[PDB]
Symmetry: D2
Subunit: 438 residues, 4 copies
Amino acid sequence: QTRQTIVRLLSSMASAKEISQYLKRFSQLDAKRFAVVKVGGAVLRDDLEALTSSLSFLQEVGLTPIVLHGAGPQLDAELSAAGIEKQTVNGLRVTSPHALAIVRKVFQASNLKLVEALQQNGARATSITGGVFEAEYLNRDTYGLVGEVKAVNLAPIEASLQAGSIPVITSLGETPSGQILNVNADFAANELVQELQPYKIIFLTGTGGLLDAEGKLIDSINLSTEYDHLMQQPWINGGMRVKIEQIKDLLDRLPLESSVSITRPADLAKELFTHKGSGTLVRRGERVLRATSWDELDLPRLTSLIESSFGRTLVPDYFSNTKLLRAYVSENYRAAVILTDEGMLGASALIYLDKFAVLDDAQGEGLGRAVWNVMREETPQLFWRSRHNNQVNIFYYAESDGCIKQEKWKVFWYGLENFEQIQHCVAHCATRQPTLLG
Amino acid sequence: QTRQTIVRLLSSMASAKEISQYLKRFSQLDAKRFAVVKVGGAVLRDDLEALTSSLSFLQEVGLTPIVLHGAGPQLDAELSAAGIEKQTVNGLRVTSPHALAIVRKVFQASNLKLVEALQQNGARATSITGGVFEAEYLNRDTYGLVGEVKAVNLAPIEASLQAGSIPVITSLGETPSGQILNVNADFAANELVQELQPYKIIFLTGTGGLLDAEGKLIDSINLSTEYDHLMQQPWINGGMRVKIEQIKDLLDRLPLESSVSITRPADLAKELFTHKGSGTLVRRGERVLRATSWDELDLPRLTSLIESSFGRTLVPDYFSNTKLLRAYVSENYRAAVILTDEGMLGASALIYLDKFAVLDDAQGEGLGRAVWNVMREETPQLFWRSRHNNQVNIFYYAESDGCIKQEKWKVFWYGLENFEQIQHCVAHCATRQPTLLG
Amino acid sequence: QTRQTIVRLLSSMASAKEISQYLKRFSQLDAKRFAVVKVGGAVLRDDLEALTSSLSFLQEVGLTPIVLHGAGPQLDAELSAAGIEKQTVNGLRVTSPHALAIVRKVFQASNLKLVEALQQNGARATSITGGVFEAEYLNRDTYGLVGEVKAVNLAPIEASLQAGSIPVITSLGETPSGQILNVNADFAANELVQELQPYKIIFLTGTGGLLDAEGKLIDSINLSTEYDHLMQQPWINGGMRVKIEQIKDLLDRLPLESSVSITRPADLAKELFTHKGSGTLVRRGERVLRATSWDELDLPRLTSLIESSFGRTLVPDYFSNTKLLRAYVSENYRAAVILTDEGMLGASALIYLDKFAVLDDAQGEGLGRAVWNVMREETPQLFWRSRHNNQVNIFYYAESDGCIKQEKWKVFWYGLENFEQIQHCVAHCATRQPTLLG
Amino acid sequence: QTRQTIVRLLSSMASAKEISQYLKRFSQLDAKRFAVVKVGGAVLRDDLEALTSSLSFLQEVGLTPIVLHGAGPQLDAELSAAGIEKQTVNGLRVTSPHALAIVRKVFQASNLKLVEALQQNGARATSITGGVFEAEYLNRDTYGLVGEVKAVNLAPIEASLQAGSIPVITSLGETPSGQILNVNADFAANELVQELQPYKIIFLTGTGGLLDAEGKLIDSINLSTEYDHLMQQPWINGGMRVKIEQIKDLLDRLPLESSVSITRPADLAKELFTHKGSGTLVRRGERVLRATSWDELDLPRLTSLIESSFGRTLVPDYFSNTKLLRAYVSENYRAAVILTDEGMLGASALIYLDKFAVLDDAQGEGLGRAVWNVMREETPQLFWRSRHNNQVNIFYYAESDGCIKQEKWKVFWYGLENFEQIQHCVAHCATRQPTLLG
């Protein structure tokens, strides 16, 4: 029903090809196994009309947020009123008896505060407060009543998602013999999700997402590639690292098509239905290897890779003819760029995009985006050809630095070349390239 | 809406007067404060289609059962599989660590099993499993992990009854600092109800209700009166006593109009909408005093008691004329029978029902029934008069041992008198009684 | 679902036996084939909050009124504003071209006015305005544009009752080739109902029902019997006759269990769920024959009639022993009273009710009521016996003029006999009757 | 609710800017005043699963199709079975008495057939069959029983759209005095719509939309402009003309933002939510005038036209400096293109797009599209400049024949120029244009 049209809004527009695909490879597959919108107390306390106005939205079309709050700003206040709010021994905290006592009530209180504001706003939330997390206890006196979420029981939650309501769950434990000690909210979600196997999975926070050296919303990450030129580059202060590592911890644990998405609530919709939103997307992508030699490849794969990505198959024996400069391939072999040397003087002088090869089940996960992204950082001057009826021309027009058309082919180049230095090399790629498919 | 007609089905029939009243004195007054249908594991395990088919019924018209299971037959099995099912030190039980462990899972399991079978059957149940009962712990090693329900938190439940679903709750505790030890299911409900303030309040059991010496369903009890000629009479074996005392414990704690009702599930409807059903009703009634002297009474009360129970007020100065044999009055002064001596030879010989005086807000709680019940055990020969348009004539026709009509009065007598011994005394009450209102 | 409890409210009370039966012999059987609540413009114009608040009620539980208005008081005004409101040639009316013109708009207007006030009040009405009644035309100039409803098309209506809404229909015709001339609203409903085959079928009117010589709501009629001592007795002024004949016209055309019911709207519920309400019920009953001779009967029928109405069968050869005074039987043989002569002096002197024999599928249609009704107009002194566990004792207690009990039998008599003249004959029936079953 | 996200799916993509606007200028404004999806018997008869599966869709989100069938293929068969299916005197038809008779039944039949298949598929249709169209009669014997829809009564329809169901209406008349003669389905809708004032308004047909000389789906028309080079050009066979004129008749009668849309049913969604679909869109646009002289304009308008279409206002006194070659403006002054001559040799040689000026409330009606469309048919060689953050760059990239970027400006040209003939003139527009805003 919905998808019938979600894709219709899609098809006729730009980033449609890559999103509609996201709606075909996951449509139908449990309800609970939709989002897993883990929130937080700073966002509860502050903006709730919009946190719940957006949670409505999904659950009122079909996609049933299986929320996971953890109210801590307010807790941290209600706790120090009587006192004992000091000491955080390790990277985490500490809690005493007359103290869980205070959390469990604040967890309770604001938990209910949510589940109601949904029901009030028109929703159907259903408080789920305990019994889900097997919180074995890490240390007894050196921390007291805190514990590492040893397992998870989904029954309590599969009930509410069999009914059809937003399982508003909690950062609380519960040993074996039933003692309820504290757990890390984050080491928590890693584990719920592992159990549930989501598709989407948003991390609401009161901020706006991840930042960069500049301080601009970095609308993506793609670990298997972008991981290093990040995890080693210093505008990655402190806990942002850990915010990153953790989300990384996760997705290795999901399929491939998953994807975190730390956004803001007002935006939540924008984020979960747009190749945009306003929250750092963040996949796991795949391992990508660069090949200088056309011999360290599974060419045959590339055949079912260019037979599946392109209409026909490659004009026979093309592979023994290919002179190969620089090759880019996804461990899985669902994406390839073949970089051939093409020009006149010598064997040079221009570097040329002979093939792009993404499989349907991919330009959706943004693979077509990660593989290409990884050569336009190696190779800075770039000239290619794409027909007129090609889908992914608009991707190109993005990258393209300039473009020129012909009823038979469209041509794109990539790089700055002085006024007189351009025309010369631009007329080239539109002269050697007419003769590549000859 | 419903009451508009519940009373229409009512008005035109027999026990209608006393039930429709029950629907006018309690209509509108919270939702949660409807039933409190505490069940049990022997009824869960065995007949659930009907336990849930009846729970539907209410919650699907408006009256929202706020259920309270406690699965124990099945627990008692799942527990001994691994073992440690022996020892019950005091009138209650005992439990260990690797042991709550087993209950909490069985409580959980069958709790969910319910909440689902409602949602499946069309209902709207909503699991509520923990955090409600403040189970302080009674003894540490001499029993281990069991506790007396020190308080109750209604939030967890007022949520689901603000939504509109059947709060399917649990016999489980939870100290202060959050350790979940065992509680008595029964000492439990006493305390939920105290907090909630129900109106109806049914105790489902797999049996059929309370029995008697014979072994016939004793469709009532009324403690303040029937208490003794019960609580001292020996067909009250063992725990039946305690089943009684406990229900007694309760209602002292409610308004007056409340009322337990131990029935079976298939019957549940019959019970909660009929002056019948098939479950021992059981109120608290009121304290009733017998008066031999027309001077140890608040006559004035009786005036607003006969001015409110009868159209007019008593023909002035009737009270200084009354010669009084035997008087029956409810501590509250909402019910009276005045027993006057009426006859010819001497001042005797027949004993005569001069007045019955029940206030609207009463023949509903069955006061008209308890006060009269308490003289037809003192006074065995009984002759009275009631007009033709009187409501409560059908009560009479019940009691009445015989009856005779006159366009101006209807006459009833009560007792066995030989063939020739009747006619003689029967013609009497229809000769001295025409001249009482003269 | 509903019946599960409608009968529970029932069973425990008085007129329950005869009404619950009405709910078992018709439960399940189309939706449209429920009511057919034909209203009228004087009730529309005046009280609509209650006409629609009651129509809601049914259609919002399941029973879907298939309403049939006919607004005429208001029409009769809106018509004379421009004029031409004079002439009513025959027992009916007359209409011209620039004139239907005015009705069709007023029919339209108030038709819509209803269908909306239902949707506003929470209902689900659905305007149905035309195309249903095949109104062939009776006379062309001598009346103009009026016609006799030659047939009916149910499609337009079975649509809205397949959806589940109150088919708010109309007193309008429509020749063959589609010209919309006027029809009698009443000759209309006769014909809809014929087509539809209702069960209940109420005639709302702004009055309160049918009256009597006195002027008291005559809560019944039963044509096949009560027809004559009515249709010939002069407090039957004018059109009341026709109101009667017409309803008579109908039911001959339905099953037996049907039944008109001219009530008021505020009462509608009371009427359609109580052996009461406030509207002249009115069946067709059956043809009843009086038999003076126990030989002009199908005794065998009476065997399956007393074998089905009573537990066992009649003590063998009882039929050749019966000395028969006066016999009452329903053409169908679903009801009998056997009147035997019983006494001492001679073969006289008391007349005695040996048998009452109603079949389940009957005391519901009120047959048990019509057959008995028809002897207590022939036979004025009446003495009978009924066990203690007998269902229909309360019917008796109604009729009974007096009653007396015995753990084995209950005894009833019928008639006024002076103080000393009673006891004598009353001791009798409780002396010859102990020895009838001997 | 919906729009909150319909626009979110939108914003991030291509044709979003022009469609989301369509959702902001019409959001909130009656319900009935949504679509007016007039269908037809060839589409009913043939594909109904999809005609109703799409009608669902709208009415089940909020947008309530107020359908308008007219079943004729099937009629034309069911009519000739008995016969009299011959003669069509004028451009229309003819019908007799024993003949409407046959339509009214077929209209009825298939009308109901629809209203049910909606209710079956999950919808909420509600048959409306008559009383809506005031069909005065055009000629009595020379055609018989056919008529021109003199007016319309919306009551019958505003009822069902106050309830919230799909008013499935009909091609039938009804004189004044209520005779139901035939009407043209098409001259019908013109008149319903006039009364209702739709926004969208689709014409389903079993075909696929309008065609061209080639025979390709002509995804648009825009009368005030494209009217002539159409209405005079001969691949406009016969009734296609009339199909056109008629839709033209209409929209002159609506606001501006309206728009027919002859599509197919399976596509209906695609059409009514995409700048695409598969049905000839078709507006009325506005009257556009070409100006050769910068003096026959309301420049001041252009100021609030370039002050509203562009951030600031025009650099003061720009208007007395403008040397103007060719000007394009919409009668209303919501759209302008200013064509200035720009080059080196002489005052020539290139023609240059100095300004595009569309008002928000416009590029939605596709004005930005019609005005520009009307110069790229006059002026064939075209060179312009647009910043990087400009919204409408993707429109451009469409038109653009080639493009080149600079962090400060983006440059586009339009036309074929030989290999050596391009570079020369292409370097130009990227040399004279850097100095236009200087």
